[PDB]
Amino acid sequence: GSSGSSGMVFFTCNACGESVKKIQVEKHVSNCRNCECLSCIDCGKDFWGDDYKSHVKCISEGQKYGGKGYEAKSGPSSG
Ligand SMILES: [Zn+2]
Ligand SMILES: [Zn+2]
Numbered sequence: 630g631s632s633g634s635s636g637m638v639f640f641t642c643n644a645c646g647e648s649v650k651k652i653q654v655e656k657h658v659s660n661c662r663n664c665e666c667l668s669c670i671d672c673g674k675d676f677w678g679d680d681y682k683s684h685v686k687c688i689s690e691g692q693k694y695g696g697k698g699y700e701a702k703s704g705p706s707s708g
Pocket of ligand 2 (some may be wrong): 672673
């Protein structure tokens, strides 16, 4: 990313499939009017609707521990 230095929260548009940053979201949405949910690759979390907003950092998240359980991921939208 053409920026002074690296170190920001990135996201993955589940609408088309592009690497959209936190601040980029605003811009992206402009073109992509199909962005419903977003995911953070930095740590790995799902943010439906306007949830990603709250997500400002990836610290204090016990994600590493766990994960295992079931391979299958795809499922009913209603989660
Ligand atoms: Zn998109
Ligand atoms: Zn994150």
